[PDB]
Amino acid sequence: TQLMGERIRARRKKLKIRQAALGKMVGVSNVAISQWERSETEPNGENLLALSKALQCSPDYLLKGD
Amino acid sequence: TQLMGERIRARRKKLKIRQAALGKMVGVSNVAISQWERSETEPNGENLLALSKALQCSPDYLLKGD
DNA sequence: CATTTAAGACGTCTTAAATG
DNA sequence: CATTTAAGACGTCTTAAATG
Ligand SMILES: [Rb+]
Ligand SMILES: [Rb+]
């Protein structure tokens, strides 16, 4: 059921920051955040690692849940 | 500095496996492993994580090293 | 034989416009 | 306004051929 992009957005909403603010922490645009959250694309390896740090969770959690 | 792909190859050689056998463990072709090792491309998010498990090191070690 | 090169399909980013 | 859509450049894969 649950997609990675849904967990990315839940974790960003928990921080209460905008897509642009998260993009800035990660080193990508607000649009890349948006594409990830909507499961349009998935983050590449370097961006997944930066995202999981900004989000304070592990890459595995983002990728596969729990 | 040392590139991620040289770290991938050094770790694979430690394990004494061919690129095809690593590929099998990760879920990609031997060519993808060749591409990564030669820094032609970098693994995407899901592949980087699968690669790090198959190699028993962390995603951060692969991407950034010590 | 193991690995690299090549070509090409599809994925992951970018900025600007549109939407709500 | 924040976000999503659009258009488009370069990135990541696959198989087949070439290389050694
Ligand atoms: Rb408007
Ligand atoms: Rb408007």
Resolution in Å, one decimal, please: 2.1
Q: Which residues of B23-45 are buried (b: 16+ CB within 10 A; e: fewer)?
A: bebbebeeebbbbbbeeeebbbb
Q: Which domains does chain B have, with CATH numbers?
A: 1-66 (1.10.260.40)
Lookup: tokens for B7: 């770290």
Footprint of strand D on the protein (CB under 7 A): A 18-20, 30-31, 34-35, 37-38, 40, 44-45; B 23, 27-29, 31-32, 35-36, 41-44, 47
Alpha-carbon gap, residue A63 to B54, rounded angstroms: 17
**Closest by Cα among B29, B24, B59, B25 to B45:** B59
Contact by Cβ (8 Å): B46, A42? yes
Contact by Cβ (8 Å): A51, A8? yes
Torsion of CA A25, A28, A30, A34, to 10 degrees: -110
Lookup: tokens for B19: 């690129």
Query: By what method was this entry solved?
Result: X-ray
